[PDB]
Structures are given as structure tokens and as C-alpha cells.
Symmetry: C6
Subunit: 205 residues, 6 copies
């Protein structure tokens, strides 16, 4: 990544073993559960495009997912090129293309130069945006259950049903009452409109 | 977070893999046991609103809880807006709204600017306050037992009963004597008023 | 805690995940075995009162113990107030009360100001003293066995008996010979007065 | 490796226990699965040739592979010598040969001198290139299955088949439709040309 | 401990969780096997007397041993007082007694002052010497087997016998040939005088 | 070890718990497998002779090996004394003997002085050389199998046989074809002279 040193200047730092292992392990343990994406963003704090490719490329499984991610990246790269066309002068900074932002046709030194320029061109942040767009698509696709099929069981605790409900909703990206069981539904209808989730959970506890 | 460098200046630092893993693991292991909240506050020392959202968003389970937390946050944000209304000048610092403090409509750079200003606007501390208010509500709700049902068993050691008692009281947020068993109750009544917990525990040991 | 930076100045540092986890785990593994207290003191090196409360508050179990600790703290705080009464001037440092030293009614900024003043008011050290006083009381109370009941078994190795003996003595806070078994007692009496523990252990080996 | 200190200057740093252990463990766990190579490159960020040899030499197993890697290295070293022949002056920097880049006939001090010169001679980067060329050959050789034999099972989920497909393709370094099972093949043919992988996976889900 | 900062000055640093845990765990795993002592010395690199007491005091088991260690320390402290008697001036450095070196009657600040003085009084090093003297006595005492009873079994590999031999010798602090079995003894006698251990091991392999 | 600080100056740093544990664990897990030696060299990067003795002395097992290592060290020390004889002036640096390089008769301060002098006397590097010479002798001795007895099994995969072959060769410090099984031998003879290992492995796959 690029970080501020002890004296304030922006400089490159190697991606740590800790960071590398943390990402690989969370993918192994959580697959494409929605919470993996906030973890990805935090672990890639200050990342260059090289760092972002490292993280994605260190993943061993899920190659269907990783190929879909490349497609999304290539769509975002193409749209960047459509909005930001480029036409170099000796010792001067060239303008980044889509593939340069994706770390494919740019060197680490060039990425550092764009990221630390004044004004800066935040190629790590632009690429992470594209990557997260792609990851969100995968999270949605690999969501195993529709929200329409999350219904409260006859003796399922309401808290457990609401957990299942908002877990599914998060992945998929009124109905809570409708999908409740008969006993809690009668209690929830009695509360009337504008009841908070807290109030609903308290009532069916 | 925002920390002081080796030369004393306030600068941003990436949230660590250690911090990220520590929070996720304590939620997995302890759920909403009351001691999780002091752990949350300590792990979020110097945190930006972005950092606070990272920590909450990396939690995979308990989505009923996390949705309740959003409601509480939105109530606190709204009250902030009622007390601190806002009406920008080129290159000048805008005033934060509720949603800016919650990290929803503010950038990392803006959060850094408020937090490091002179005088500072401590948006990380204000948001953590709101989050802990919400977490305390959840801890209370998910408390499994009323203090009225913590009673000493016939041959339960007094120490074990007092542990259960103050564990429950902590979550729920004279009676100790009343809920004691007959043998220890007779001993505790004999001590008279103003006895310390130490004195009570010594007597029923 | 408060530490010296690379250039020598006293500044605040966030309590680490390593420190937080180390304390919680030693309490879980050792409860109130006497060696926990030296571990507590070392893990709280340079700690503010806020840091000390964090450590105590992150403990999930043993709430009977933690309530007794609060009583002890409140007794020490009251005695501080009796010896150090307080009667503020704009932008000037106020005098700490008992509750300020215990971190209850003082901010982190105030604690930093007292701790880094010239001359300093070491509120972290004063509070740790009170906490350790309270912990020692608990260690003594939760000591399972009187030293009078640590007696050497008929075929118990002397080394194993002496370990049990000084383990118990440590928790409770001539007799070694008296509580020895007949065979070793005869050997130990033959050594005469002024024999070292080493000499005693060698003789009964 | 060679890193920038707090004040910006390029200096040598010892390879860490963390880095050493991370590499050895990933080889033990993943052998020559293709994702090991991006891990190797990241763990060797800023590495000297000495560091690169350390990493390779700490591997205990797979000596057939490591001997093949030496052959590849020696081929690249020889080609370097063919393009960059060398003909020293007291206290002056000599030109590196193939074996100097491979860390065989060069000292650490010489490697540091080439790497930190102005203009620099990036001997760590040149050698890592050679090593990765050799590793890619091994990954291909140790690929257990041809892409021609990755066919969808009668009731294998399409996602699981695509994972197997792109896993194999990655190691080996239209057909996806042809190797699909009859049911999904009929669905995929109906989509027509130019369908994305996402569209294909959605259709056969 | 006391370490050099980034700018070269000698300053106090808190004992780390890593150091604290490493010592406690090696005692738990190895007891008083002789290799524990080099580990103790290395883990206490730069230690103050306070740090040394922390390490010893964090040990939960082996209180017979720890009481013997106190006796040894008190003997060394007394001898220090006999050689270095002491007779203070406002704001001036007092001379250390035995108990000050052992960290019993000295503050951390005083220990820092002696250790960082010019010329320095290395109270951490003097105390570690006393502690290691005491630990060596315990290692010898807790050695389970005399070297006279380490004899090669009829079909015990010579390497395994020599390991047992020098393991025992290390703890206890010509005979190798005499204690060998008949077959290897005949081979070893044939080598004649002045044979190396390597030569002996090669011959009986 | 001795490292460069943030400002470039050569200063002593304590050996880390991480380094100490890493060495002890690799010896426990790998014994004297040949890959332990590159691990030793890397873990002892920048080591003083004191550090090197620490690492060797923290090893609990294998005392036959460690005694052989002392013999080798003493032979190298004696040869140093034969080539570098020594004949001190107040406040001046004395010349190191063999035993000073081995850390036996030299202080840490003296080792630091030699290592950081201009010109430096690299006593850590000279001693590590001697130690590795000794370790290589042990690796060879403890090699369980001659290369002459590594022969391919009737249905052993060629890759598995080549792994065994170069594993043994590494420890021991044309034949590959001769020791192959009849089926692969016929294939390998057909390739003719000058075939690479890659080509051989491909052919017998």
C-alpha cells in the first residue's frame, strides 16, 4: 500500500503477511457471504492496483467468481476509456487507461506516481470501486435463498427468524410481518403502523 | 484510526488485520454479552466513522441486532440535525450533519478534516457514543434471564450464585439476600444492615 | 497507555488488541490464582485510568469478584478525598478527586494532562495501586485451601508437597516440617535449625 | 528486503519470521497450485536475490520441482550473460552477471549496491522474474487434469462445474458450453453468441 | 526493558505481551530443563529489575523452585551489601543496595537512573546474573537421572544413547565409552585415544 | 542483532520472541533436515555471536549434535588463532580471538564494537560461517539413506521417485536414470543424452 511515514510523506509499503493471510482465510471461511466485502475494503486500505490484484490472485478457489469479476472489471475499464481518452513527453507522467487502473498495463512505479501526484489520481481507490461492484454482483448471485422463502417456523423464536430475514436481505441487496408465523403475526398486526423493529422483537419475545 | 506519529502530528492510519479479526472473533464468541461493549470501545480507539462502520459491517451474524442498531443511529443522527442545523465556500470545511457523523454521506478526507481541525469536531467519538447507546439496548434485549429469577440453589455455593446474580444485573442494566437460599439467608440476616459484599460472601462460604 | 515516542515526548497510545486479548485470556485460564496479579500489572504498564477500566470491564465472568473490586476502589477513592480535598480557572488544570483517579468522572484528556504534567500527578499508577489492593483481597478469598491442611501424603514426593505448600501460602498471603510425612519429618529434624529449603529438599529427595 | 526508512532512504531490512513462515506454510498447504505464485511474489516484495534464495531454500519437500527451477534459472542467467557481457576499478561497482543476479556469486553488499544505485540495477526484480518463469512451468507440469476432461456431471451444479473448469484452465495456462451436461447445454445454446459468464451461470442455476 | 529509540537515546519500554506469554509458556512446557535458562536470558534482554521480577512472578507453578530462587537472590544481595556498603543529597542519585538491585526496595525510576547513568550501574544485568545462578541450582536439583545411570541399551542406537548422555550431563552440569553397550564398546576401544565424537558416532552407526 | 535505525545508524536490538520461537519450533519439527540450515541463516540475520549462542543454546533436544557442533566450532576457532595471532591500550579496541568470535570470551559490548567499527570486523558473520559448517556435517551424518538405495518402485510415480532422489542427494551433499524402474528407464534411454529433468519428468509422466 501507500502510507504516510513518521515524517508525513506518502511512500510505498509492502503488503504484509498478516494482510495476505487475513484475506485468503476470510474467503476460505466465509466464501461470498456479504460481510466479506467490508473486510476486503478494510484489508485493502491504501492499496495500489498491484496490491488489489495480489489479494484477488491469492484466492485459490471460486474461479467461476474470479472470472466473473474480471468481466465486470473489463466493463468498468472500457467505460473509463470512453470518458477519459488518452493521446509521451520525456520524464513526464502519462494519463492512465482502464487497464492501467486495473494494474494490468501499469507498473508499480507508475501507480505510485499517480497516487502520490499533486493533484493525485487515486488509481487504487478507482480500481477498488470497480472490484467491489463486481464482488456485490457475485454476493447477490451466490445468495442461496429468496427473501420470499424466509418464513417464521411454527416454534421458531422471532429473533432467529429476523436474523435469517435480514441475513438474506443483505445478500439479495411489511414483508417481515407477512412472513411471520400466525401467533406473532397477530401480535405484530395489533401494534399498528410505524412500529420499530425493537418494538416488534420485544412484542414477539 | 487517527493517531499521533513519531513527531506528534495527527495522521490517519489503516485499521489493522489484528483489530479487524479481534472484533469479528469476540462477536462470534460472546454475541451481545455485556463485556463485548468495553471491548468494542477499546478496539475502536481513535476510530473514524469509516472505521466504526467497517467494524459493524464485518459482523456476519446477528442481522436483527445490526438493523436495530441502524434505527438507533438514525434516531441519534436526526436529533443531532435538530440541534445542529446547517446552511459551501471554496476550499473551506463544511459543517457535519447526522449522516456525516455516521459515515454515510461523508468521505474519509472530510472525517479526517473534522477530527484534526483546531478546534476539532470529534466525529469518531460522537458516532461511537451513538453506536454504544444502540449496543446497550441490544445487550438488554438479549439478556436471557430476569434478575427476579436468579435465586440460589439448595446446595449452590454462594459465590456461584452471586456470579450469576451480578452477571444478569450487568446485562439488564436487599434482593441478593432475598434470593439467597434458606441457610445463607439466615446467616446474611444475622449480619445486619450495611454489610459489604465481601463480608456477605465470607459469611456464606 | 502513555509512552515515550521516538523523539522522547510523552504521548497517548491506544491499548493494543494483543494487550486486550492477553488479559481476557489469562483471567479465563487462571481465574484469581495469585500469579494473575503480576500479569495484570505488567499488561497495564503505562496505563491510564481509562485503560485500567477497559481491562477490568472486558472480563465477562467473575462478577461477584468485580463487584467486590468496585467496593475496594470506592473505599480507596473516599480515603483519597479525605486526604486531598478540592475547591475552575479558564484553561487551567483542576485537581483530581477519587472518582477522577478511578476514571469514572474524568475524561481521557484530563487523565493525559495529569499524567504528563510537570510535576506529574500519576493517576494511572495511583489507581492501579487501588485495583491491586482489591485483587489481592479476592485472591485471598478465593484461595481454596488453608495452609494448615497442606500435609505431605505417605508416598507423595517432597518436591510435590513443597510446591502445594508454597502455592497455598502465596494465595493466603517450622510448619513445612510439621506438615511433612513421618519419614521426611525424621530426616528434616535431624538437619537441625537454620537449614535452607534447598538443603531440606535435597535431604528428603 | 530493501525498504524505505522513516526518513525516505533505501536500506536493507532482515527477512522476518512472519515472511519466512508464511512462505513455507503455503507451499506445504497448496504445493504448486497456481495461486501460490501470486503469494510468492507478494511475500518477496522488495527482496534481494539472497532473500529469494532463502525463500526457495527453506522449502523442504518437492526437490524435483526445486531442481527444475534451478535449470530454468540457469537458462535465464545464461541468456542474461549473452545479452550483457562484462569485462575492476578500486572502490567501484562491477557489472552483474547471471549468477550475480541469481545470488550465487554476489554478496549481500553487492546486491544492495546494485539495487540502491542511481540509476538502480534492480537485481531482486530481475531474479524474481526468472524464478516466476520457472514456477509457472512447474504449475503447468503438476496440473493433474486436462481441460478436455473437465465435463459437467449429470446432476453437478453448473457453478461447481465452472469452478472446476477455470481452476484447471488457470493451472494449464465455446469449450465451457461443449463440456456442459445435456440440460444446461440446451439452455446455453438458446442464449446465443456473446453471452457473459454471469448470464450463462444465471441461466443454468 | 531499556532500549535505544530511533534517535539513539536510552529509554524505558513496557514489557510486551509477546515476551510475557513466551516466558510463561516455556516454563509450562519445559519446567526446569536446562535450555529454559538461555531462553530466560534472551527474553529478559535489556530488562530492568522490575521486568525480571515480573517474569519470575508471572510463573504459577513450581513454588518450591521460586522460594529456593528467593533464597539464592537474598544470599547474592547480602554479599553485594558486604562488598558495596552505602552511607541523601537533594536531587542526587543514591547508591544501590542488594535489595535495590533485586527490585524489592527500588522504584522503576531509580532503576532507570542507575541503568542510564554515565557511567552506568547495570542493575538489570547484575540481578539477572543472580537469578541465573539460582536457576542453574534448580536445574541441577531437578535433574532426574545421574550420568552414571545413562547406559546404552542392547539394541539402542548409539545416536539415541549419546543424546540421552549429553542431555543428562547438561542438567547435572571415557565415561561415554564405558557406558556404551558391548558391541559399540568394542568398536570404540578399537579407535584408540583422541577420537572425536563425530568419529565415535560414525563408527557405531 | 545489529540493525540500522530510522536515521541509518548501526545499533543493537534485542532478539525477538518471534525469532526465538521460530528457531526452536523448526528444530523440533524438522530436526536436521537440510532445509533447517537456510532457515537458521535467515533467522540469524544481523546476529551477534551472543545471538547465535542463544539460538543454539535454546535447543533442548539433539545434544549429541550440539556437542559435535562445539567440536567443529573449536576447530574453526583454533584455525582462526593460527592465522590471526594477538599480542591493551586504555580505551582501545582489542583484536578478537577464536573464542571471542564464538562469543565465549567476549562481551556483547565488544561484539558490538567489532561489528560496528570502521572498518568493521564482522564477528557475527564469521561465527555463523563456522556454525553452518558444523550444521552441514550433522545434516550429512543424520541423512538416513544413501543415494544408491533410492530406486523407483514398480508402480511409484516418477515425480515421487525424483522427489525422494533429490531429497536424499541434498542431505548427502546418469544415476537418476539407472535407479529408475524398467518402464521409465526404457523411456529415458530413448531420449538420448542432454535431456533436461523437465523433459525426463514429462516423458515418464
Amino acid at each position: 500500500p501507500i502510507v504516510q511515514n513518521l515524517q508525513g510523506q506518502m511512500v510505498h509499503q509492502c503488503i504484509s503477511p498478516g494482510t495476505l493471510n487475513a484475506w485468503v482465510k476470510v474467503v476460505e471461511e466465509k466464501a461470498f457471504s456479504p460481510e466479506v466485502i467490508p473486510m476486503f475494503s478494510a484489508l485493502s486500505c491504501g492499496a495500489t492496483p498491484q496490491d488489489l490484484n495480489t489479494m484477488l490472485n491469492t484466492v485459490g478457489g471460486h474461479q467461476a467468481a474470479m472470472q466473473m469479476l474480471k468481466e465486470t472489471i473489463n466493463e468498468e475499464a472500457a467505460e473509463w476509456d470512453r470518458l477519459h481518452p488518452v493521446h509521451i513527453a520525456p520524464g513526464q507522467m502519462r494519463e492512465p487507461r482502464g487497464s492501467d487502473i486495473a494494474g494490468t498495463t501499469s507498473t508499480l512505479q507508475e501507480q505510485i506516481g499517480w497516487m502520490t501526484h499533486n493533484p493525485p489520481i487515486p488509481v487504487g481507490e478507482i480500481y477498488k470501486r470497480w472490484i467491489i461492484l463486481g464482488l456485490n454482483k457475485i454476493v447477490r448471485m451466490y445468495s442461496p435463498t429468496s427473501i420470499l422463502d424466509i418464513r417464521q417456523g411454527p416454534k421458531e423464536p422471532f429473533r432467529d427468524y429476523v436474523d435469517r430475514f435480514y441475513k438474506t436481505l443483505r445478500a439479495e441487496q411489511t414483508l417481515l410481518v407477512q412472513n411471520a408465523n400466525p401467533d406473532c403475526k397477530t401480535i405484530l398486526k395489533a401494534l399498528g403502523p410505524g412500529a420499530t423493529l425493537e418494538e416488534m422483537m420485544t412484542a414477539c419475545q
